[PDB]
Design a binder for this molecule. Structure first.
Ligand SMILES: [Mg+2]
Ligand SMILES: [Mg+2]
Lengths: 363, 365
């Protein structure tokens, strides 16, 4: 019903009031009692806080630890969560030009595929994250019954929505809805007019089922960054070539062809034994096994007000080249490389997955 | 360890303009009968009444957040916060303001559940220790920490230099036994911006467990004027306390040089916990006993002042309930007096409306 009052999802490069981030904890997903991941989340929050306000949300047991680790100008609030992926469990904010001029969408959530296919067995706290954030900020809430995660949608703020079929059409999401029915809900809720459907996401992203935000994103209207490799023996290659083909046959909501900038993935990363042994083994979440291909891409960066927060994976040549490409692509932003982003990818995500932008409310 | 006095701050009176009111949410079964359901309804009643005057935020534990959110109308903000019990007057911050870094700050006093390991009301106050910091963090308001144990219900101010307190509470060996009266005054001058003190020896009869907070005994109606808990029945143990307090007040001069005027606010006829009430409480030995026959510490002085409103208890004594509304209405002719029914449900757990609230002053421009 956001179409009724002229709401739309702005592009991520439009002005933010603040960024929301969770705080990692669970010992069956985050190694060494999540301490290495905590230092990286703190580093991401601090980096962003140079550009715009940040609120970090931490569990009751973690609140003091978070407050101690984070700069004073970063707000720390108590919140229960099952895990710390606010891109996906937090609200998708929408605005209008004028009662209020901002709202948040609270989508249904099922831990990326639910009882049979999801990443963990209990998502009851995550179900409340969006409501709690919006209640805290006194921003109106639109609830939707469809299962959706913010990491599965990208917009250019000019009417186009970029998505994957792997995720949005998956049997573990909304199998009762056709492609056209899904598009219809996204038009009404995000204020978009047209879609670009990539068939697949990044190789190795079986746990999210191929979220767009680890595969391809907008840099500006008519221009995307695409995860790329020239190595034809990498299972990523066929996905990248297929996506490029689809993009070359796509037109955006304003009638533009799409320019594609290749953003080369790191050389293949595989979880080590020291890494896998630091994680508790039982049956509340998916097993983390030694030798699994890490789903790493530089495309999982976050845009803040005048800043680009980008991962660094410990691949010397590809890390520096990603910074060069991103600096060239966003010449009016400052690019900041986040070391030890590998610590987030071990848990199945990256910088974009841990953030949720709150747009500035228009006046 | 810089003092509020250094930065220009003082505690404004409760009748000055608020940005919002903060309230906790009751839960624990060894203090609140029938799984806290009766008490939740009265807390919700208080929040709704205040919400007609000014914004309200209710804080509820992780396990209660959904129940609170469903119970309360959406114009009341509901936030998740861990707590050992729901007495935000005492565990929440004491806000202070200045004329001209923000023009509002909060004091985060030390806390020990009203007397500590040997004389306190429950055995674990770990979450309560963090309530003030969490509230101030939520609002991005600067924090002044104090190592002295103090509850907001133990102090009252007129916003004009006077502080009203009880000896029973602040000089108790269960609070700050290594501080003298003079040392306590000096800290309160620095932190609240006060210059003079009115010390009543004792608080209300029946308030043994919290050691006689001023806010259940006597408060300011306006600068120079106090409301005093009163009875004319000389067989009630309350009588000697009321008479003693009146004597002190009658010889008191406030910070601006006014002789204090006293308005008597008559307590209800003596109220006692019933067997039905007591039997609804779990006896787990983490909290103090709640026994049938106990005198309830009930006084109409334990009201809250909101922007244009007075939120006052009704205890079920129909004569004294009506008289208290009459007195309050006469005393606050520019406020709307609202009576909260079933306030007895709060008093069964040792407090009342003033004890469950914490005002956040408007920040001066
Ligand atoms: Mg949701
Ligand atoms: Mg405190």
């Amino acid at each position: 019903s956001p179409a009724e009052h002229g709401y739309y999802m702005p592009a991520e490069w439009d002005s933010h009031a603040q960024t929301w981030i969770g705080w990692p904890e669970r010992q069956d997903n985050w190694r060494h009692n999540a301490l290495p991941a905590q230092r990286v989340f703190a580093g991401v929050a601090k980096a962003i806080s140079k550009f715009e306000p940040v609120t970090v949300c931490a569990s009751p047991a973690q609140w003091e630890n978070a407050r101690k680790q984070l700069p004073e100008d970063i707000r720390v609030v108590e919140m229960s969560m099952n895990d710390s992926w606010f891109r996906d469990s937090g609200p998708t904010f929408i605005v209008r030009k004028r009662n209020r001029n901002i709202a948040g969408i609270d989508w249904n959530f099922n831990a990326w595929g639910g009882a049979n296919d999801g990443c963990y067995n209990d998502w009851s706290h995550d179900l409340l994250v969006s409501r709690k954030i919006l209640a805290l900020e006194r921003i109106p809430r639109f609830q939707h019954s469809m299962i959706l995660e913010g990491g599965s949608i990208h917009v250019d703020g000019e009417g186009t929505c970029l998505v994957t079929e792997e995720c949005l059409l998956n049997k573990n999401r909304n199998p009762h809805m056709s492609k056209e029915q899904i598009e219809e809900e996204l038009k009404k809720y995000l204020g978009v007019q047209s879609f670009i459907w990539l068939p697949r996401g990044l190789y190795g992203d079986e746990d999210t089922n191929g979220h767009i935000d680890n595969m391809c994103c907008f840099a500006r209207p008519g221009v995307v960054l695409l995860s790329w490799t020239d190595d034809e023996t990498d299972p990523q290659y066929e996905r990248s070539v297929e996506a490029l083909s689809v993009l070359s046959n796509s037109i955006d909501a304003r009638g533009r062809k799409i320019q594609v900038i290749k953003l080369y993935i790191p050389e293949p990363l595989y979880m080590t034994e020291e890494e896998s042994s630091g994680i508790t083994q039982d049956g509340e979440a998916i097993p983390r096994l030694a030798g699994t291909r890490l789903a790493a891409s530089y495309v999982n960066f976050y845009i803040a007000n005048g800043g680009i927060i980008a991962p660094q994976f410990g691949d010397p040549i590809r890390d520096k080249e990603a910074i060069r490409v991103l600096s060239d692509t966003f010449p009016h932003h400052s690019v900041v490389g986040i070391e030890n982003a590998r610590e987030i990818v071990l848990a199945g995500g990256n910088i974009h997955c841990i953030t949720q932008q709150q747009p500035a409310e228009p006046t």
